[PDB]
Design a binder for this molecule. Structure first.
Ligand code: HEM
Ligand code: HEM
Ligand code: HEM
Ligand code: HEM
Lengths: 141, 146, 146, 141
């Protein structure tokens, strides 16, 4: 479902962003909350005001999770099992919200890395985020 | 769709800077690559078999310019999107049989292209405003399906 | 939504035979099991942790009966679905924050329950008619989101 | 993403339907064409009238493909590669249509096997059809 070319595109793009990933996670969340206000209802405990320390810190966690996924493209269910438990069993996040965050991740990457964000890379990253979303919204105990 | 004065300004400020010759073709091209089933509707457009073929496709570029102009029509008619797009809604439904979900996809791809072109200028605030626009256009084009 | 006289008869013929005490609770129960994120909206309903817990849940059964009655209201008001469901559309959007996609899901689950209950009587022709109904109800409940 | 319980539910249900699978494939197609008329535009070469031999024959092929999938739940991309080539590269079927057919497959099974079609089995079958749909709509050469 992810092609060999997809995996190459994902790994290469993710390596290029390097240590900026954490920041981009924060920005993507900010974009998601601003563009799609209903997503904020999952974070009532968060200060969601500009410059939020909670959002910045959480963005780092999201980025780290995606970094883990990049290292395990052939076994996402195994690698992200704990995150599936959280998002599927405990948080019970509507799959629609994953589409919204994935879109804002693409937007964030396009904003920062125009040379890297080719149509082919765009396509591979969308499939990457979709694959991760499916795992986190699935109950597979 | 209702945009506040602030949201309208954020949209208009960016839109005036848009390359009208390139952005629409890039949006359409990316739609055809990222969501490749959309290629089904474009048999008369010639080679779409590779990303490079799609992005160098002259007809995709020309049609993209028309799509972008149609978005520009929506921006000038935000309070009457259903009326502006009723004829186009009829076309996409009755003649073309395009599933409405794809209208949302093109809207989001256009957003990605705007982000690509404007970088840091495409702020979260500017994006939020544009999401209201593209959702409005997608809803308007889907109106005659119901 | 417009149903032909024939489609209306197929719908009404089956609907009169529906167990109004069970079908709605079974539809809601199956929604909560097949699409388990929908459970998020039902914290006050108690145990939903297993299929058996969901299907034996008294509140799910009682609420399901109300949902089924609301579908019955739609069947009696097919030419004014938006007006019939405007208050409910407001509730699901502003108070409950239910994503509109889920309305389509419940509609299709109800269809599955009707199929389950009626077997061969739930013909492809009867189904086609019911799909128009459930799509209409889902569209009507989504109206105040736009 | 498919749970161990899902796989058990899928295998058991599919074995119970046995030789009726082919017929059910035909019925599911008929249901799809009648309920969702836009799906018919993929089959302009087909006679889609009542009792169609083409629909019956094609239903058998669809059923056989699903039977193959049941035998390869842990490697659907490998097992269904040729069908991905057909549906993704050549036919370019909109993913929406897979959701419509999957729904009508569920309806067909519910119509014929009420004892088998429990809420848990219903859930597993929906995930099964979704997994197959993802493979057939993905380009993974
Ligand atoms: C790209 C897909 C996503 C990834 C990779 C991801 C990753 C993560 C990670 C790593 C955590 C922290 C877990 C821990 O500390 O043990 C987390 C928590 C959380 N996630 Fe996600 N997530 C994703 C999508 C979403 C979406 C779409 C929502 C809903 C809008 C959501 C809602 C939450 C919430 C409410 C928490 C708890 C935050 C806290 O209390 O600190 N997640 N996620
Ligand atoms: C984002 C919303 C969209 C807008 C504003 C839009 C706009 C337009 C416009 C202005 C035309 C030309 C009408 C004419 O001159 O006759 C057109 C035609 C067309 N559209 Fe779209 N469109 C949208 C979405 C889509 C999508 C998502 C698809 C397919 C997935 C699609 C497929 C087509 C096709 C195949 C034609 C005819 C092209 C030809 O053969 O000349 N459109 N659209
Ligand atoms: C198929 C279309 C639907 C119909 C016709 C429908 C109908 C209704 C009705 C009649 C009520 C009671 C209103 C009242 O007395 O205040 C209600 C409430 C509610 N609905 Fe729905 N509904 C639909 C879809 C959904 C979906 C898909 C969800 C969640 C995924 C949902 C979640 C809720 C919740 C959480 C309540 C309040 C329950 C409570 O706490 O008492 N509804 N709906
Ligand atoms: C459950 C998911 C599906 C499965 C398992 C499936 C399976 C198959 C199989 C086995 C074939 C025959 C391939 C061959 O003979 O080499 C086929 C062909 C075909 N499929 Fe599907 N399919 C699915 C979904 C769809 C959908 C949703 C559509 C569009 C509505 C579609 C459109 C077609 C068409 C037009 C053909 C060619 C038929 C012919 O010319 O005889 N398929 N599919």
């Amino acid at each position: 479902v992810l092609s060999p070319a997809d995996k190459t595109n994902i790994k290469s793009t993710w390596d290029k962003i390097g240590g900026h990933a954490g920041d981009y996670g924060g920005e993507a969340l900010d974009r998601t909350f601003q563009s799609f206000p209903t997503t904020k209802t999952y974070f009532p405990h968060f200060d969601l005001s500009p410059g939020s320390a909670q959002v910045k810190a959480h963005g780092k966690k999201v980025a780290d999770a995606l970094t883990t996924a990049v290292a395990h493209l052939d076994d996402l269910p195994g690698a992200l099992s704990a995150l599936s438990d959280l998002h599927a069993y405990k948080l019970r996040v509507d799959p629609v919200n994953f589409k919204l965050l994935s879109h804002c991740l693409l937007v964030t990457l396009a904003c920062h890395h125009p040379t890297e964000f080719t149509p082919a890379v765009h396509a591979s990253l969308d499939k990457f985020f979709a694959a991760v979303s499916t795992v986190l919204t699935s109950k597979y105990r | 769709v209702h945009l506040t004065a602030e949201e309208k300004s954020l949209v208009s400020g960016l839109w005036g800077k848009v390359n009208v010759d390139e952005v629409g073709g890039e949006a359409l091209g990316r739609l055809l690559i990222v969501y490749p089933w959309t290629q089904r509707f474009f048999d008369s457009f010639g080679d779409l078999s590779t990303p490079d073929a799609v992005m160098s496709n002259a007809k995709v570029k020309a049609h993209g310019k028309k799509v972008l102009n149609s978005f520009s029509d929506g921006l000038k008619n935000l309070d009457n999107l259903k009326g502006t797009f009723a004829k186009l809604s009829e076309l996409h439904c009755d003649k073309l049989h395009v599933d409405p979900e794809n209208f949302k996809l093109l809207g989001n791809v256009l957003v990605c292209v705007l982000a690509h072109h404007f970088g840091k200028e495409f702020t979260p605030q500017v994006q939020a405003a544009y999401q209201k626009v593209v959702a409005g256009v997608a809803n308007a084009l889907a109106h005659k399906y119901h």
